[PDB]
A paper describes a structure:
The chloroplast envelope Quinone Oxidoreductase Homolog (ceQORH; At4g13010; molecular weight 34,034 Da) from Arabidopsis thaliana is associated to the inner membrane of the chloroplast envelope where it represents 1–2% of the crude envelope proteins. Despite its original annotation as a “QOR,” ceQORH is inactive on quinones but preferentially reduces γ-ketols in the presence of NADPH. γ-ketols are long-chain reactive electrophile oxylipins and are potentially toxic. The ceQORH monomer is formed of two domains with (i) the catalytic domain including residues from Gly3 to Pro132 and from Leu277 to Pro329 and (ii) the cofactor binding domain (Val133 to Leu276) showing the classical motif of Rossmann fold. In the ceQORH structure, the internal chloroplast targeting sequence is folded as a two anti-parallel β-strands (Thr71 to Gly81 and Asp91 to Leu97) connected by a long loop (Ser82 to Gly90).
The 13-KOTE binding site is large and solvent accessible. Upon 13-KOTE binding, the loop from Leu97 to Gly103 moves, thus stabilizing the ligand. Thus, the 13-KOTE carboxylate group is an anchoring point allowing for oligomerization in the crystals. When the apo-ceQORH structure is compared either to the ceQORH-13-KOTE or ceQORH-NADP+-13-KOTE structure, the main chain from Asn46 to Leu61 and from Ile250 to Lys269, containing the α-helix Pro254-Met267 involved in the dimer interface, are shifted. 13-KOTE is not a substrate of ceQORH though it displays an unsaturated double bond in α,β of a carbonyl group.
Numbering used by the authors: 4 to 329
The structure:
Amino acid sequence: KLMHALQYNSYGGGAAGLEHVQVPVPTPKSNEVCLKLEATSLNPVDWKIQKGMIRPFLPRKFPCIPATDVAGEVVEVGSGVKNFKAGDKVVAVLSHLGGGGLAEFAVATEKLTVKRPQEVGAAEAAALPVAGLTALQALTNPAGLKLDGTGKKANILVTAASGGVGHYAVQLAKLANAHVTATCGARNIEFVKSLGADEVLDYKTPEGAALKSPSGKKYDAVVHCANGIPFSVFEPNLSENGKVIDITPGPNAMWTYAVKKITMSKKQLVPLLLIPKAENLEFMVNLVKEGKVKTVIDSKHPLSKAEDAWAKSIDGHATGKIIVEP
């Protein structure tokens, strides 16, 4: 019947603007499944939407229940659901239109729900969807690396590699047999080395502010997860046809993309929008199961204290992924 959740009913609230509320448990449609949530993961998008930065596209209507990355147990399925039964443990991606993550229950489409193996925890799994698939898409599509053994070997730069997409990106890039150069805060330099990065740079230094690799590497692709960097700084560090992949693209990135396209610049800036596909989520889940990829969890917060997790996300000093559990 009813359900604990967190809502914002207005732009600009910050964590203060979140409200604990009791709300009717959603009902699954033909193709949806209903989950008792075991873990929910935050993404920077989630608090940006609330700040109003994604207007006029999101949020669709107030009030909003935030977060899309989710793991839990199937409680109930819709008439059309073929592949999941009640009791099944899953990981899923909620619609970016309706949100729903910060709650006891959520409905997910079957096409974005994946069975979660016994080996993989709920928090470990819930951290995967947006961050992991983004990292995966960037390295698979624009960077053009296979992740078996048949991919192009290459030089990869990962900016802000201590964060959500960042720390997945480094691990994945290593599985594609790439040389990985990474940037992060001084504190996280040892951590990023442990993800498999070949070179790690303190971004406040001179070689890291300029993104110059000690081997003198030029990068074939950049999984760009940081924010304050103009194409100027990337350019001299790029290979002849290097692509900087902005996984959090603003108007600046969008414009640069247009200009570099229309002037046929050999060096390119690629805005990335994630297209979550269940095959990829299944894939990432397997990588975690097989130990080829580890999820690092910055912190775990109870839904009753979810604003803390929200504020931690807003500060964005998180290392890996922030998790909210019941």
